[PDB]
Write an enzyme that holds these catalytic residues in place. Sequence first.
Site, PDB file in Angstrom:
ATOM      1  N   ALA A   1       1.546 -15.190   5.415  1.00  0.00           N
ATOM      2  CA  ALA A   1       2.276 -15.695   6.565  1.00  0.00           C
ATOM      3  C   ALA A   1       1.434 -15.721   7.827  1.00  0.00           C
ATOM      4  CB  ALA A   1       3.526 -14.855   6.805  1.00  0.00           C
TER       5      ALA A   1
ATOM      6  N   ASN B   1      -0.491   6.888   4.084  1.00  0.00           N
ATOM      7  CA  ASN B   1       0.416   6.572   2.998  1.00  0.00           C
ATOM      8  C   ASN B   1       0.833   7.822   2.239  1.00  0.00           C
ATOM      9  OD1 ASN B   1      -0.245   4.094   3.970  1.00  0.00           O
ATOM     10  ND2 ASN B   1      -1.326   3.406   2.135  1.00  0.00           N
TER      11      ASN B   1
ATOM     12  N   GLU C   1      25.721   9.129   2.499  1.00  0.00           N
ATOM     13  CA  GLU C   1      26.118   9.997   3.595  1.00  0.00           C
ATOM     14  C   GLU C   1      25.243   9.798   4.822  1.00  0.00           C
ATOM     15  OE1 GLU C   1      28.982  12.505   3.447  1.00  0.00           O
ATOM     16  OE2 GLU C   1      29.348  10.839   2.072  1.00  0.00           O
TER      17      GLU C   1
ATOM     18  N   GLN D   1       0.832  -1.199   0.000  1.00  0.00           N
ATOM     19  CA  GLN D   1       0.000   0.000   0.000  1.00  0.00           C
ATOM     20  C   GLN D   1       0.866   1.249   0.000  1.00  0.00           C
ATOM     21  OE1 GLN D   1      -3.541   0.011   0.347  1.00  0.00           O
ATOM     22  NE2 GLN D   1      -3.783  -2.211   0.465  1.00  0.00           N
TER      23      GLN D   1
ATOM     24  N   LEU E   1      22.113   8.700  -0.196  1.00  0.00           N
ATOM     25  CA  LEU E   1      21.887   7.720   0.854  1.00  0.00           C
ATOM     26  C   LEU E   1      23.181   7.287   1.513  1.00  0.00           C
ATOM     27  CD1 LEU E   1      19.531   7.359  -1.398  1.00  0.00           C
ATOM     28  CD2 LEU E   1      18.987   5.328  -0.081  1.00  0.00           C
TER      29      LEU E   1
ATOM     30  N   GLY F   1       3.539  -7.613  10.874  1.00  0.00           N
ATOM     31  CA  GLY F   1       3.276  -8.397   9.690  1.00  0.00           C
ATOM     32  C   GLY F   1       4.102  -9.661   9.621  1.00  0.00           C
ATOM     33  N   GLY F   2       3.439 -10.796   9.413  1.00  0.00           N
ATOM     34  CA  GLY F   2       4.167 -12.047   9.310  1.00  0.00           C
ATOM     35  C   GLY F   2       5.132 -12.047   8.145  1.00  0.00           C
TER      36      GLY F   2
HETATM   37  N1  LIG Z   1       0.916   3.009   7.660  1.00  0.00           N
HETATM   38  C1  LIG Z   1       0.253   1.962   7.191  1.00  0.00           C
HETATM   39  N2  LIG Z   1       0.339   0.751   7.839  1.00  0.00           N
HETATM   40  C2  LIG Z   1      -0.333  -0.315   7.372  1.00  0.00           C
HETATM   41  C3  LIG Z   1      -1.103  -0.192   6.241  1.00  0.00           C
HETATM   42  N3  LIG Z   1      -1.661  -1.385   5.993  1.00  0.00           N
HETATM   43  C4  LIG Z   1      -1.258  -2.259   6.935  1.00  0.00           C
HETATM   44  N4  LIG Z   1      -0.445  -1.603   7.805  1.00  0.00           N
HETATM   45  C5  LIG Z   1       0.231  -2.208   8.952  1.00  0.00           C
HETATM   46  O1  LIG Z   1       0.939  -3.307   8.420  1.00  0.00           O
HETATM   47  C6  LIG Z   1       0.628  -4.535   9.033  1.00  0.00           C
HETATM   48  C7  LIG Z   1       0.059  -5.445   7.949  1.00  0.00           C
HETATM   49  O2  LIG Z   1       0.470  -6.786   8.063  1.00  0.00           O
HETATM   50  P1  LIG Z   1       1.437  -7.424   6.952  1.00  0.00           P
HETATM   51  O3  LIG Z   1       2.800  -6.800   7.001  1.00  0.00           O
HETATM   52  O4  LIG Z   1       0.844  -7.256   5.585  1.00  0.00           O
HETATM   53  O5  LIG Z   1       1.507  -8.976   7.350  1.00  0.00           O
HETATM   54  P2  LIG Z   1       0.982 -10.114   6.356  1.00  0.00           P
HETATM   55  O6  LIG Z   1       1.607  -9.934   5.005  1.00  0.00           O
HETATM   56  O7  LIG Z   1      -0.513 -10.046   6.224  1.00  0.00           O
HETATM   57  O8  LIG Z   1       1.382 -11.490   7.083  1.00  0.00           O
HETATM   58  P3  LIG Z   1       0.703 -11.762   8.521  1.00  0.00           P
HETATM   59  O9  LIG Z   1       1.193 -10.684   9.447  1.00  0.00           O
HETATM   60  O10 LIG Z   1       1.025 -13.116   9.119  1.00  0.00           O
HETATM   61  O11 LIG Z   1      -0.789 -11.628   8.393  1.00  0.00           O
HETATM   62  C8  LIG Z   1      -0.383  -4.217  10.114  1.00  0.00           C
HETATM   63  O12 LIG Z   1       0.230  -4.383  11.367  1.00  0.00           O
HETATM   64  C9  LIG Z   1      -0.740  -2.759   9.964  1.00  0.00           C
HETATM   65  O13 LIG Z   1      -0.514  -2.117  11.188  1.00  0.00           O
HETATM   66  C10 LIG Z   1      -1.192   1.022   5.590  1.00  0.00           C
HETATM   67  O14 LIG Z   1      -1.881   1.130   4.589  1.00  0.00           O
HETATM   68  N5  LIG Z   1      -0.510   2.106   6.064  1.00  0.00           N
END
Ligand SMILES: Nc1nc2c(ncn2[C@@H]2O[C@H](COP(=O)(O)OP(=O)(O)OP(=O)(O)O)[C@@H](O)[C@H]2O)c(=O)[nH]1
Lengths: 427, 428, 376, 365
Positions: B90, B219, B245, B15, B243, B134-135
């Site tokens: 994940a 975003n 420096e 995103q 980058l 995030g996994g």
């Molecule tokens: N700033 C921001 N953070 C986001 C956004 N979308 C998701 N997040 C954060 O990113 C994480 C999303 O999980 P992922 O990194 O995609 O993990 P995954 O790929 O689904 O794998 P699993 O964690 O096991 O489900 C969440 O903890 C949110 O807090 C976004 O659009 N903007």
Amino acid sequence: MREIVHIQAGQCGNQIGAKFWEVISDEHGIDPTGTYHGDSDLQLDRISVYYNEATGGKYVPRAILVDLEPGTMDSVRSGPFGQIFRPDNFVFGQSGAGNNWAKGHYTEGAELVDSVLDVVRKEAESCDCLQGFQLTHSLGGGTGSGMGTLLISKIREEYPDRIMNTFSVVPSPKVSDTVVEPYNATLSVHQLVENTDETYCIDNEALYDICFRTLKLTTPTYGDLNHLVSATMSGVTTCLRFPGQLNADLRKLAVNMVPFPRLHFFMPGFAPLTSRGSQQYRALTVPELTQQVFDAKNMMAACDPRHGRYLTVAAVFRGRMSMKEVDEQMLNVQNKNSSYFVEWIPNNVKTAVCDIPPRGLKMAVTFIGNSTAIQELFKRISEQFTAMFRRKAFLHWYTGEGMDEMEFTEAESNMNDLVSEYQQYQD
Amino acid sequence: MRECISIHVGQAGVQIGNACWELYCLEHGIQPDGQMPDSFNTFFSETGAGKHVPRAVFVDLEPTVIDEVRTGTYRQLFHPEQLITGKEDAANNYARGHYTIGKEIIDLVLDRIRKLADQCTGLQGFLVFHSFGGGTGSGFTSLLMERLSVDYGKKSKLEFSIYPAPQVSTAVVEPYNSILTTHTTLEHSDCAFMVDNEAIYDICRRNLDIERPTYTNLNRLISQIVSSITASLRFDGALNVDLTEFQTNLVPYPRIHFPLATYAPVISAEKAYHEQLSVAEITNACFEPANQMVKCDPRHGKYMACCLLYRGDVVPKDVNAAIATIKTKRSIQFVDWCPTGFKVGINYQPPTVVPGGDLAKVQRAVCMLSNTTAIAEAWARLDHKFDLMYAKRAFVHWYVGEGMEEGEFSEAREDMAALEKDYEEVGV
Amino acid sequence: ALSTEVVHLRQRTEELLRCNEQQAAELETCKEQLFQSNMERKELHNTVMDLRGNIRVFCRIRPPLESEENRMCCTWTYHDESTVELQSIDAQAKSKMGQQIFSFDQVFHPLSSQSDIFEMVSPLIQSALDGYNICIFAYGQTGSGKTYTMDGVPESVGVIPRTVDLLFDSIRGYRNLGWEYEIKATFLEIKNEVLYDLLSNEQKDMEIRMAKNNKNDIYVSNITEETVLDPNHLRHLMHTAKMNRATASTAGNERSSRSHAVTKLELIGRHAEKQEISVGSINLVDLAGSESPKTSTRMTETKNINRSLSELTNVILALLQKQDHIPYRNSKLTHLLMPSLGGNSKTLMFINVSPFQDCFQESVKSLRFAASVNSC
Amino acid sequence: LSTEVVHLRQRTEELLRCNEQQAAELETCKEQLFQSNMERKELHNTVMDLRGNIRVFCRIRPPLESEENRMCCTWTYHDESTVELQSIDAQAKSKMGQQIFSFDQVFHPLSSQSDIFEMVSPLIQSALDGYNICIFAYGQTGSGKTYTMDGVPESVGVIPRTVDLLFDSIRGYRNLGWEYEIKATFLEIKNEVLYDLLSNEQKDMEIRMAKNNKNDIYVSNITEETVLDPNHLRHLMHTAKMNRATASTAGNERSSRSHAVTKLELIGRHAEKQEISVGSINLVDLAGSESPINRSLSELTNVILALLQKQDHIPYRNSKLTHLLMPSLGGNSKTLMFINVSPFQDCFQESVKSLRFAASVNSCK
Ligand SMILES: Nc1nc2c(ncn2[C@@H]2O[C@H](COP(=O)(O)OP(=O)(O)OP(=O)(O)O)[C@@H](O)[C@H]2O)c(=O)[nH]1
Ligand SMILES: Nc1nc2c(ncn2[C@@H]2O[C@H](COP(=O)(O)OP(=O)(O)O)[C@@H](O)[C@H]2O)c(=O)[nH]1
Ligand SMILES: Nc1ncnc2c1ncn2[C@@H]1O[C@H](COP(=O)(O)OP(=O)(O)O)[C@@H](O)[C@H]1O
Ligand SMILES: [Mg+2]
């Protein structure tokens, strides 16, 4: 594409599945024929997860129907959305379990399990990447319990990687519909705690309270209860079938919910439940959805959460909303009801904002709480079971079927162990 | 051209990168198709035809969001083989994304990035966007990072990871993922820019005065941050900083490489009329703890180093004056042993506002890449949550059941404790 | 010398009958006193064990080979017989991990041989004769000496042969007490979370089931139960079981060094005169390799092994913290060993450590939770 | 008639054969009995070692009928091994801090003689294993030390119960081939002068290291009555307490300031085998702990504190009572020490004086 295989055991499970499939088809704009007529290509994008493709632009549910008497399936096939199923899937015996778990897990199950597992394999191999199985049944009756446990034990031992979904309809505490449902439930959970990994406990008394009070319903036909359950079930996977801000799936929440392998029994909950005419008076925003979804008045299970602690809570959202609200309100409810939450799991809330709301609706929430209040239900069932055990009430019907009473002792001890776990983690 | 390439893992990474690349192609007048109806070569490997492919590698273990971008307005923008997708997410598991699906797609993604690097003439560095809870963004990110450090080592690896919020944890198992990925990333990360959702939420509340902020707006903000970071490459300024420096200027020690970002002129359009947006005032604003993009109090920790990136209509005299004033400030603490850390990045390309965005058209903007002691408590509380989980061995069965040992959990835990120890001992 | 001979023989018969009566009365008294002394020492020894233990963690390090001693080795600091200090030579490892000190019941020197093992077995077999269910755990990584300590070598046998001989001499001595001991040999293997049989090659189905007598007592259906008649019979059974467990241990490390072999010797002593029966069982269980799963070939069962090990750790720490319920049913190994883990049952915990750098993380992992067990 | 002769001959042969085999089995069983008993004693002393070494106990005694109008203190009981006392004077409550003491066991005024004898009885068995045992009752005047040691005919003290258990164990062990002799010496230390409690023939009395053990102590000129039965030792105690010259009626400074040493030496020999034991029980009733002679009491306190400190040198020969118990305070031996506390406001400072000794004892171990 993470397809899901649907199994329906017992006549309760069959009716629930009928409701579930009709509501899903409504979601994806599928006619009774199977010809798609919706508009949003998002319906097509994940149409595979539930529908196998069919020649000529038709779709068939990836569903299996199991029973030991034909009558329910005859009703389903005769009923609307009956022809939608591929007729080969209707697997049924002729005898009937007769509300006896022993039959449906040792004799009729024995003779029908292969005749269903074959088509199970056939469906499984017709999938790209199998996600898991959802089983719809009831713990009270005979076939939906004995057969259901048999199928779970089978599927697990050759699909150990996958995940199992059991929406067991837990026996009611007061309005008992079967003189022997203690035996069925106790024998079932013995298998349940060993093989499946997430179980949605549902009670009919709680659903009666929902429809009569919150919905102001006066004719709580089983159609309405099944409609409620189906709405919850579709909401569980809408993140899988649809895009969203935080796409979750069965794998996603599976790990989140269960701290330990055995503690995998959940209390569902569906938020927007405006009555027949009170929709005018109520604004539909995230605050209402959250506060409503966190009421003991709204749990589909008959346990009062206030008697225990929420080990874990998941909250799946449908529709267009700003996740800022949902973050802050989860924080809010975590603060206010801190007594209601286990201390050693901070921020024990899971959020899964999806995008598409249910048809005719703007916002929707599905609740899944793994609270410790279930131990009261299990204590109630254990008490009922042992009450009619040492008097050996109805024992002969089971014993003469090819089981020994030490099996009853086993199941009872195991369920007592479950109760011990829950009461122990209450502190 | 000292070109750079970007990596996006997980829903957050994808995103964020979507917002970023939309901003970039807006900067240079690039249509979503990929043609401009020089500068951009750093990020666009423009071919003979007017098809300026971005140097972006999108990886995810589930096909949902990537498929969405393959359906969005930018499908034809990206090279179709760039967008790599798995089949199952994940599911919040470091275990899955580092052992069971990660190595099943890592060969392909490594091959694609190898091809991209060979495409580039002067390889500058790497950009990765991911999360911690995030996994994928934990397990897969750590795996890929150590793999690259094996492959190149010498290049610049920059993380724009998203720190978990202190009050809201969307995933119940975030502490485990965070601790594991930090332990496995510490020794392979050149410099990791951290940001948090709760802080940016407060920002869009009290400054943008947006009442219903969506992930799109956050975003947009991160995109502005990264655009400021890369402006010195994509554009010419009075003082350009690459980058390379950054590692020298920011990190005093190999382990202490977790700056936090800040972006000053974040006012809404209606308030834009009531302010002149002077250099000095925005410089002061970027030091306001209420303006930080990480929920921590800089007031409670000394600063290690500060990097300031100015873009737009700016004058060096003003910048020097404002820096001198901030040096004269009292609440602004500094450690003695580095008494001069204010490396400046003046540039004269004004930031551009996305149509339909929330920010206002501003003449000058500054991005502050502070590194400070004020992050020690964030690690402290993260470690505390981890200890709470691990005391009851909660959820451990999922992880040990898919690739690791609880002994490894203890390894990461004590490693983090040592990190906090070193961080505080530097603090004095 | 005939008429008086009759009187003399009558007197001699009277005296001999009197001696018979006295010896019989005093023999009944001395049998009773011997039983009373035996049960008094049973209770005294169990009190000793409980005060000093009931969860015994023993640590041993094998000596490196003549070529592996020239291979780099860490500094081993033995502060006393109960504490051992492991320090990695690497400077960065020293800076990050710091000092790795650990506390245990007793620390083994690499030159301690098998004598200390025997003198810990002696109270162990003594308590086994008390009618107590005792379980033995041979934990550690591959090549650290687990097979060297359990099975042993022809020049220096492992724990098992010494225990077999000690038990046989103990039961033959207790036969002088009128105690008839029936000893049952049970062998099983836990792989892929499904039980197997070591004595039978044919593939049958096992299931865990509580015994008819008591819920706490557990047996397994459809096992090959052998009644031990002579020591050499038991030795031959163990040899056949070791031959049946033939798979990759170090060349491929496929299933061996990754399996859980449970050796349970159910002993049932009976004494018909006083109609008392003593029931006990010893569990000579060796663990699997604790190494981090890196073989992508068959990582799934390695993850299952890690699950089993983590569940065993959780069970033992629940034992320590006086937890109301202990998750025996989370894993097969814990569930079938629940009689040997709870209540009056006593566990020796044995750990083997490798003296090389590549096991530093694994050595530390092995030591840390055991020291935590010692703390509580 | 010769048929009867031949029948009697064969009967004599079979009877002698059966007698011989039965006797061989009997002797083998006796050897097994002895081998079991020695291990039993070893296990018992191992239990004694594992339970601790100092065995700190506090015995609070109820006020008497003449003590009902006195002011008590706030006894804050914790679990079963920790006790806290507070003065009801609220002005000094904030000036005292934390007057909390944790011992091995806590005895409250509702505890009978049986409660203390439960802890004391295994030490009699340990003394039967050839080890020296000491029982100490410490406290100020009126605390209850004599009640702990001597008691009353209604609720007998520690000594009569120890004697009864000793004789029961001796007659139980008589079947184990061992014979025991009880040697009883009654002695009192007033001002570093030893007084024989079983004879009025005043002489000079001195302490000398044993002729067969330089680490053991035998006292010259002491009468050593061989106890035959509990009645004999009861008569000896009666004569000793008669000879003690209990001057409580006139000049209480004599009785309430003298240490009373009761030594009970147990010796065990075994014919047809080897067994040498010199285990002795020192039932010492310590004098008042009130501040002012106190040479013996201070020396005992310092010796105990140094022994718990593993001190290189123990000041054994700096007082009569320490040098008397020099072999009775060895490392291998087990020591018991009771603190008797008067639950009175006027005794609050003497209570804390008696309790801070054990507070240093458990903090030094
Ligand atoms: N700033 C921001 N953070 C986001 C956004 N979308 C998701 N997040 C954060 O990113 C994480 C999303 O999980 P992922 O990194 O995609 O993990 P995954 O790929 O689904 O794998 P699993 O964690 O096991 O489900 C969440 O903890 C949110 O807090 C976004 O659009 N903007
Ligand atoms: N929600 C719902 N529950 C049902 C329905 N029909 C039956 N049940 C429940 O199912 C239980 C009966 O067991 P069932 O499985 O139908 O009997 P079986 O099919 O022969 O095993 C009862 O407790 C009912 O409450 C239905 O249409 N909807
Ligand atoms: N638990 C008790 N119950 C009743 N009386 C007691 C108790 N303890 C001590 N006494 C009284 O204390 C007297 C013993 O004096 P004591 O305090 O032992 O002298 P000392 O000051 O030398 O210790 C007895 O006469 C008895 O009446
Ligand atoms: Mg006195």
